[PDB]
Amino acid sequence: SAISVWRAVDYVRMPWKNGGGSTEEITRDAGTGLEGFGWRLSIADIGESGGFSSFAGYQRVITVIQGAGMVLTVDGEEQRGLLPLQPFAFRGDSQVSCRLITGPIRDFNLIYSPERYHARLQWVDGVQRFFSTAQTVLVFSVADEVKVLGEKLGHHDCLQVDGNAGLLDISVTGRCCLIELTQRG
Amino acid sequence: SAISVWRAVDYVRMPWKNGGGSTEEITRDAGTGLEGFGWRLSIADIGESGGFSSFAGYQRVITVIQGAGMVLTVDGEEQRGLLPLQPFAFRGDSQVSCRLITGPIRDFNLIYSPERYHARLQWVDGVQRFFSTAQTVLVFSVADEVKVLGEKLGHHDCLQVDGNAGLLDISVTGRCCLIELTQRG
Numbered sequence A, B: 001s002a003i004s005v006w007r008a009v010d011y012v013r014m015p016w017k018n019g020g021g022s023t024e025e026i027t028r029d030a031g032t033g034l035e036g037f038g039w040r041l042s043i044a045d046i047g048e049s050g051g052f053s054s055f056a057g058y059q060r061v062i063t064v065i066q067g068a069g070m071v072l073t074v075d076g077e078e079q080r081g082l083l084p085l086q087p088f089a090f091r092g093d094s095q096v097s098c099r100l101i102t103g104p105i106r107d108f109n110l111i112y113s114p115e116r117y118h119a120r121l122q123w124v125d126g127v128q129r130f131f132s133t134a135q136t137v138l139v140f141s142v143a144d145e146v147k148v149l150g151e152k153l154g155h156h157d158c159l160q161v162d163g164n165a166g167l168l169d170i171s172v173t174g175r176c177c178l179i180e181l182t183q184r185g
């Protein structure tokens, strides 16, 4: 089991082509096929209301992490309110748009290919402990200090365990999102 | 002392903001929340001439590992030709641009914070043996087989020893880069 830590102060802001905001890539699988990535973690800055790009064949789970929330319109809609730290799953082929009813928003974005990855996502707080055989475990901090696997994650830092091949026993303290990804087949 | 072996097939690639190329992450230290990584290994794919990101307070050592070579301009100063496997050191704060003259180039990139890490870098071939108290030892292979510490590194695989706390006795065979990093505590 290899531990890597992604520090948010090292993230690179990539403005969107449409000027509606920007993306900070955190990490992703190798995923270099014409098929593309198997999974990707990023933080999206959403600066103005607008539509979301499509990602046919991918599952998305997004979570507001900065800002008071925003409203989403998914396909044929009831409008969905996204509050801070409330994750929201939707298919990547859905037509989705957001309205920034309180100002600009930052989302924590998980996207993965159901064909290629098993996936688990859970926001947690306090002291947590889990056992997992998942190949990749990610811990994304939204606190000043999330302690996990001997590391201290600051704000939007992300710890990544890779190449797990046994049962990991992981304790976490603090407000963070736990993601577990395992290659299928 | 824990050994990880990063396999080049799993190197996560990220494209550059300006589109000039891409960076494959090899490994980086855990860093801190405030100051980000203290060091990083990566392979940069340079597909177009152009400028290099600046990294104030960081020291860089880059080495052409694929392609016939390229020309650097460091600040406004004289051109530097980088030939395959000739390491070149420069400050992260210097404005640096490269001119491709033979096509795209791949660089092995070391970066570290001199305030936070002692560092050593040496390209070697053949049989090597060294003793080092360094806390982290990385061996980056540019050969089909580099034997070190009972592992076998293939093309651009990278061995990493962490948390060494005595005098390591390390033997290496084959064409590779030896990097040693120690926190300045």
Ligand SMILES: [Cl-]
Residues within 6 Å of the ligand: A052, A053
């Ligand atoms: Cl999007």
Ligand SMILES: [Cl-]
Residues within 6 Å of the ligand: A040, A042, A109, A110, A111
């Ligand atoms: Cl995404």
Ligand SMILES: [Cl-]
Residues within 6 Å of the ligand: B052, B053
């Ligand atoms: Cl660069």
Ligand SMILES: [Cl-]
Residues within 6 Å of the ligand: B040, B042, B060, B109, B110, B111
């Ligand atoms: Cl670098």
Ligand code: NA
Residues within 6 Å of the ligand: B034, B035, B036, B037
């Ligand atoms: Na830094």
